[PDB]
Amino acid sequence: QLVEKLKTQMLDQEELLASTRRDQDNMQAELNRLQAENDASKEEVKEVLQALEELAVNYDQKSQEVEDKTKEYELLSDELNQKSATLASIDAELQKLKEMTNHQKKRAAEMMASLLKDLAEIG
Amino acid sequence: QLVEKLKTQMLDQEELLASTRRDQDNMQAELNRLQAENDASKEEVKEVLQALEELAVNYDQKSQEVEDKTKEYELLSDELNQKSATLASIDAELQKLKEMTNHQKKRAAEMMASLLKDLAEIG
């Protein structure tokens, strides 16, 4: 009669120990999930850092290329501006050539007329 | 009889003047094609220069962003490395808790046995 009361007091004290042992392995269960996420987050971050240091050299190489291309065209612009000076002078060269070919036929009209005038006097 | 010889001498002298006038307008024809290409090449180049100066500010803004992101992660890496210090200590915290719950039931086995021993002596 007294025994079944005492036996149950151990049994409650028995499942109590079973509970904390279930906890301390459930608590460690998620602790090795956190320890997994943490060491998984380092591998991600260590790659992002490795990628950015690979981007830092990338954009630096390309910025040098811009300053190299801007120098190439700043030379070209100053050249084509010097082309306009040449071409405009070849225009002035050609307007003065037209002035020479018009005087050549103007002189040709005189020779025709001054002959054409002298013939009319003969008559 | 002599007239048709003289008349042809002017006619050759006439088409000769017609030729150079055709040339001096054909020569100026391509000269205003070159003057077109040249002033068309300036508008292209002036845009390339305007584009590169817009690329120079572009890559400079982005390179600053890399150094800003590398600083953000260099802070994060040093934080997650400090997370491993905490989590590993919580592991050591939990192994010492298991040491406390095992001693609790080891002490519980003694009380059962030392009672179980005293009962056998009664008999």
Side-chain angles (χ1 to χ4, degrees):
Chain A
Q1 44 187 330
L2 193 69
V3 154
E4 277 190 323
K5 179 166 199 57
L6 163 66
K7 287 180 57 177
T8 46
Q9 299 199 12
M10 299 180 186
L11 276 178
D12 310 355
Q13 204 179 40
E14 200 67 23
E15 293 150 7
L16 196 145
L17 271 298
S19 77
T20 78
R21 173 56 54 165
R22 286 188 288 168
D23 294 6
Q24 288 172 1
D25 296 330
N26 269 342
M27 291 201 290
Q28 194 151 337
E30 67 177 355
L31 257 67
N32 293 99
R33 175 188 75 86
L34 272 47
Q35 184 183 348
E37 285 181 11
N38 205 43
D39 292 57
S41 300
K42 297 180 182 176
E43 205 67 13
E44 300 178 5
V45 167
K46 103 157 186 60
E47 283 163 28
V48 179
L49 289 178
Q50 180 169 330
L52 295 184
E53 270 85 309
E54 196 172 333
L55 262 56
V57 300
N58 190 7
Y59 291 157
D60 195 17
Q61 288 172 359
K62 294 203 285 192
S63 291
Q64 156 220 18
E65 293 187 351
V66 175
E67 202 191 23
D68 264 353
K69 275 293 182 179
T70 307
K71 173 64 177 184
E72 288 192 7
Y73 285 103
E74 278 186 359
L75 293 180
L76 192 64
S77 173
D78 293 2
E79 153 69 19
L80 304 181
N81 263 283
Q82 201 59 29
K83 202 168 193 73
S84 296
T86 295
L87 298 195
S89 176
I90 308 204
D91 258 20
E93 261 208 339
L94 212 65
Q95 307 299 303
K96 292 163 183 51
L97 257 63
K98 294 178 180 177
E99 195 179 18
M100 287 166 49
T101 205
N102 289 10
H103 176 278
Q104 272 293 321
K105 83 151 164 270
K106 194 174 72 65
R107 164 191 174 89
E110 298 180 7
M111 292 183 172
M112 167 264 279
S114 195
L115 157 75
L116 185 135
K117 161 195 180 299
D118 286 326
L119 301 185
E121 291 185 340
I122 267 64
Chain B
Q1 44 187 330
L2 193 69
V3 154
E4 277 190 323
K5 179 166 199 57
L6 163 66
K7 287 180 57 177
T8 46
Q9 299 199 12
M10 299 180 186
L11 276 178
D12 310 355
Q13 204 179 40
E14 200 67 23
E15 293 150 7
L16 196 145
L17 271 298
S19 77
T20 78
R21 173 56 54 165
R22 286 188 288 168
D23 294 6
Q24 288 172 1
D25 296 330
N26 269 342
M27 291 201 290
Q28 194 151 337
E30 67 177 355
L31 257 67
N32 293 99
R33 175 188 75 86
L34 272 47
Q35 184 183 348
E37 285 181 11
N38 205 43
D39 292 57
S41 300
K42 297 180 182 176
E43 205 67 13
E44 300 178 5
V45 167
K46 103 157 186 60
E47 283 163 28
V48 179
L49 289 178
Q50 180 169 330
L52 295 184
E53 270 85 309
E54 196 172 333
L55 262 56
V57 300
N58 190 7
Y59 291 157
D60 195 17
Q61 288 172 359
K62 294 203 285 192
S63 291
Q64 156 220 18
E65 293 187 351
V66 175
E67 202 191 23
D68 264 353
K69 275 293 182 179
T70 307
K71 173 64 177 184
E72 288 192 7
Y73 285 103
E74 278 186 359
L75 293 180
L76 192 64
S77 173
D78 293 2
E79 153 69 19
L80 304 181
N81 263 283
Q82 201 59 29
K83 202 168 193 73
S84 296
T86 295
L87 298 195
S89 176
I90 308 204
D91 258 20
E93 261 208 339
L94 212 65
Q95 307 299 303
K96 292 163 183 51
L97 257 63
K98 294 178 180 177
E99 195 179 18
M100 287 166 49
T101 205
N102 289 10
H103 176 278
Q104 272 293 321
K105 83 151 164 270
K106 194 174 72 65
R107 164 191 174 89
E110 298 180 7
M111 292 183 172
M112 167 264 279
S114 195
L115 157 75
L116 185 135
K117 161 195 180 299
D118 286 326
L119 301 185
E121 291 185 340
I122 267 64

